[PDB]
Amino acid sequence: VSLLSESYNPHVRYGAAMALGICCAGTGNKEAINLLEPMTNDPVNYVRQGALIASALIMIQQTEITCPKVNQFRQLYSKVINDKHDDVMAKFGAILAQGILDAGGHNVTISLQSRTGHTHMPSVVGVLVFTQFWFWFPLSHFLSLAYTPTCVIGLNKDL
């Protein structure tokens, strides 16, 4: 993604930011989080809106201790929403990005891979449709299905 992230096309940069976020998913590669920050400052609003949402997908399953900029991205989302001068298109998904980080009260996170290594069928469907959510606003609901909980179930008996 890093070479693709810097390109003439607004679409290729926006796509690279979206791509980097989805492959890493909940996990953060550190290099990936660092790459996202310049994408946020990119002049095109279309690239900027993608960067804010992509950072949020990485931000779920993360806390300030684990990643230094987790609070800074949260402050950034509030700042862009607060600033009228910031483009309405640019802010677009920053409020949605706060929802992505706070999804299920932060309890749930996006994971496409089982511990066994089996691919999660809901996770892949939700993320792929979520990229088409920019093409279609209601496809955001498809992302909701792919929100695996970090909780553990421990029952001695089923009932």
94: tokens are 């920053």
CA-to-CA separations, 64 to 21, 49, 61, in angstroms, rounded:
18, 23, 11
Q: Is 98 in the site for another protein (CB under 8 A)?
A: yes
Q: Which of 19, 104, 124, 128 binds another protein (CB under 8 A)?
A: 104
Judged by beta carbon, residue 73 or residue 92, the one nearer another protein is: 92
According to DSSP, residue 113 is labeled B
Q: Among 67, 102, 124, 128, which residue sits at the site for another protein (rule: CB under 8 A)?
A: 102
Task: Give dist(CA 2, CA 16) in Å, integer.
Answer: 8
Instruction: Indicate whether 23 belongs to the interface with another protein (CB under 8 A).
Output: no
Binding segment toward another protein, per CB under 8 A, in 15-23, 30-38, 63-71, 148-156: 148-156
Piece of the chain touching another protein by CB under 8 A; list 22-30, 34-42, 61-69, 76-84: 76-84
Structure tokens at 63: 């806390």
Per-residue b or e along 124-143, where b marks 16 or more CB atoms closer than 10 Å to that residue's CB: eebbebbeebbeeeebbebb
The one-letter code for the residue type at 71 is N
Q: Which stretch binds another protein (CB under 8 A): 25-33, 62-70, 74-82, 111-119?
A: 74-82
Helix (H) / strand (E) element for 108: namely strand 108-109
Binding site for another protein (CB under 8 A): 6-8, 10, 45-46, 49, 78, 81-82, 84, 87-89, 91-93, 95-96, 98-100, 102-108, 122, 133-138, 140-141, 143-145, 147, 149, 151, 153, 158
